[PDB]
Short mmCIF file of C-alpha atoms in Angstrom, two decimals:
data_model
loop_
_atom_site.label_atom_id
_atom_site.label_comp_id
_atom_site.label_asym_id
_atom_site.label_seq_id
_atom_site.Cartn_x
_atom_site.Cartn_y
_atom_site.Cartn_z
CA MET T 250 -37.01 -11.98 4.64
CA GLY T 251 -36.07 -15.48 5.34
CA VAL T 252 -38.82 -18.11 3.97
CA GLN T 253 -42.62 -17.80 3.32
CA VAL T 254 -44.47 -21.02 2.78
CA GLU T 255 -48.23 -21.14 1.18
CA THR T 256 -49.71 -24.39 1.21
CA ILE T 257 -50.04 -26.33 -2.42
CA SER T 258 -52.36 -29.55 -1.12
CA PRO T 259 -52.53 -30.69 3.06
CA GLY T 260 -51.49 -32.86 4.87
CA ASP T 261 -51.91 -34.46 7.75
CA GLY T 262 -51.18 -31.75 9.08
CA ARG T 263 -50.62 -33.22 12.31
CA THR T 264 -46.97 -34.36 11.49
CA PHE T 265 -43.86 -32.07 10.93
CA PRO T 266 -40.73 -32.78 10.63
CA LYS T 267 -38.28 -33.37 13.96
CA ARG T 268 -34.31 -32.53 13.47
CA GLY T 269 -32.12 -35.84 12.99
CA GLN T 270 -35.05 -37.06 11.18
CA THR T 271 -34.56 -37.68 7.12
CA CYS T 272 -36.73 -36.24 4.96
CA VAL T 273 -38.67 -37.54 1.90
CA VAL T 274 -40.25 -35.66 -1.10
CA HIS T 275 -40.15 -34.55 -4.75
CA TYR T 276 -39.51 -31.34 -5.50
CA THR T 277 -38.66 -28.81 -8.55
CA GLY T 278 -36.58 -25.49 -8.40
CA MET T 279 -37.62 -22.29 -10.12
CA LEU T 280 -35.73 -19.09 -10.55
CA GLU T 281 -38.41 -16.16 -9.14
CA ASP T 282 -38.93 -15.49 -13.12
CA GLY T 283 -40.06 -18.84 -13.28
CA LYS T 284 -37.18 -21.15 -15.24
CA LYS T 285 -36.88 -24.23 -13.39
CA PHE T 286 -32.71 -24.93 -12.65
CA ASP T 287 -33.54 -28.59 -10.54
CA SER T 288 -36.30 -30.55 -10.24
CA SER T 289 -36.78 -34.61 -8.60
CA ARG T 290 -39.67 -35.34 -10.72
CA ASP T 291 -37.31 -35.49 -14.11
CA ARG T 292 -35.41 -38.20 -11.93
CA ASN T 293 -37.96 -39.90 -11.56
CA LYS T 294 -36.20 -40.13 -8.24
CA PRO T 295 -37.25 -38.34 -4.29
CA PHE T 296 -34.55 -36.32 -2.79
CA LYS T 297 -33.61 -37.19 1.01
CA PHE T 298 -32.46 -35.14 3.46
CA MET T 299 -31.66 -35.65 7.05
CA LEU T 300 -33.30 -32.74 9.44
CA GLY T 301 -31.06 -29.82 11.11
CA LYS T 302 -27.81 -30.89 9.69
CA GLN T 303 -27.32 -28.48 6.90
CA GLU T 304 -27.16 -30.63 3.70
CA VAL T 305 -29.73 -28.44 2.72
CA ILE T 306 -30.25 -24.18 1.99
CA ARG T 307 -31.26 -22.67 5.04
CA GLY T 308 -35.23 -22.14 3.64
CA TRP T 309 -35.46 -25.86 3.21
CA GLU T 310 -34.25 -26.44 6.83
CA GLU T 311 -37.09 -23.84 8.71
CA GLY T 312 -39.54 -25.02 5.35
CA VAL T 313 -39.67 -27.82 5.18
CA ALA T 314 -39.83 -28.43 8.69
CA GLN T 315 -43.86 -26.35 8.79
CA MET T 316 -45.19 -29.35 6.62
CA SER T 317 -47.09 -31.80 7.08
CA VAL T 318 -45.57 -35.47 5.72
CA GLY T 319 -47.87 -35.56 2.46
CA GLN T 320 -48.73 -31.70 2.40
CA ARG T 321 -47.06 -29.91 -0.81
CA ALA T 322 -45.82 -26.65 -0.16
CA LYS T 323 -44.51 -22.98 -1.69
CA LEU T 324 -41.93 -22.17 -0.42
CA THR T 325 -39.78 -19.15 -1.96
CA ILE T 326 -36.43 -18.27 -0.56
CA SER T 327 -34.54 -14.97 -0.28
CA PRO T 328 -30.77 -15.42 -1.20
CA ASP T 329 -29.53 -14.54 2.04
CA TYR T 330 -32.13 -18.22 2.76
CA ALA T 331 -30.47 -19.42 -0.19
CA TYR T 332 -26.99 -19.19 -2.18
CA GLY T 333 -27.34 -15.84 -1.28
CA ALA T 334 -24.39 -13.02 -3.32
CA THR T 335 -22.36 -16.23 -4.85
CA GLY T 336 -25.07 -17.62 -5.95
CA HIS T 337 -23.88 -20.46 -8.27
CA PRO T 338 -22.34 -20.65 -11.24
CA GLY T 339 -24.19 -21.06 -14.69
CA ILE T 340 -27.05 -22.59 -12.17
CA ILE T 341 -28.33 -19.62 -9.74
CA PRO T 342 -27.38 -16.20 -9.70
CA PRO T 343 -25.99 -13.13 -7.15
CA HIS T 344 -28.74 -12.85 -5.00
CA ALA T 345 -31.73 -14.87 -6.52
CA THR T 346 -35.02 -15.09 -4.69
CA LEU T 347 -35.47 -19.40 -5.45
CA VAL T 348 -39.46 -20.56 -5.64
CA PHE T 349 -38.86 -24.24 -4.15
CA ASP T 350 -42.97 -26.19 -5.00
CA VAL T 351 -42.18 -28.96 -2.27
CA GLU T 352 -43.74 -32.24 -1.82
CA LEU T 353 -43.09 -34.04 2.07
CA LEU T 354 -43.69 -37.74 0.96
CA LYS T 355 -42.65 -38.96 4.44
CA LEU T 356 -40.16 -39.26 7.19
CA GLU T 357 -37.83 -42.11 7.61
#
């Protein structure tokens, strides 16, 4: 599968990220069992990336683009849209489905 987007709290419902814009997010990343492996919130610094530059996993590129500014949403991302068969040594196991809690704070 690809990425599933499930709403947590609504955004403005009008402003969606376009290619080339910088997305400013807080996020928490968990394995399928629920284990947290990464979180911008624990660092108390929002994470920024530019849509369309493949700075993030494909599930983020296609999933965050479906969110409106101010929305919090749950992205469930299959391995093909994530770290794949390889995963990430000691962080993300092979063939892992990941769950991201993502809040799109603003676009720059």
